[PDB]
Amino acid sequence: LCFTNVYADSFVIRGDEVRQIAPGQTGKIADYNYKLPDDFTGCVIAWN
Amino acid sequence: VFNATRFASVYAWNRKRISNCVADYSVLYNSASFSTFKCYGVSPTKLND
């Protein structure tokens, strides 16, 4: 596969809040720090 | 309900009737203490509406 534009967004969070990074989710990260679009095309990657 | 000194044993699980009162589920849902908060016929964001 090929990609037309690509952007990697980098940040650090509490491990409980990893769920809030999925599209359409809600809570302090998803509400006031970093929101994905509902039709997000892309991947979310996290490591301890 | 959430801040009693002791809870029931599951075999004899308690049932309290919540009535004639205003409910603010944002105080519950924003509280990071709840390791599960799963809703089955409403979305948690809609509980306030």
Write the layout of secondary structure elements.
This is part of a larger assembly, with 2 copies of chain A.
Chain A: H1 28-32
PDB class: viral protein
Keywords: viral protein
Entry title: Structural impact on SARS-CoV-2 spike protein by D614G substitution
What is the C-alpha radius of gyration of chain A, as a whole number of Å?
Answer: 12 Å
As an assembly, this protein is part of a larger assembly
N-end to C-end Cα span of chain A: 29 Å
Order of helices and strands of chain A: H
What amount of the residues of chain A lies in strands? under 5%
Taking the sheet with the most strands of chain A, its summary is: none
Give the tally of β-strands of chain A: 0
Structural category of chain A = little secondary structure
Work out the helix count of chain A: 1
The largest interface is: A-B, 3 and 4 residues
* Overall geometric form of chain A: globular
Percent in helix of chain A: 10-25%
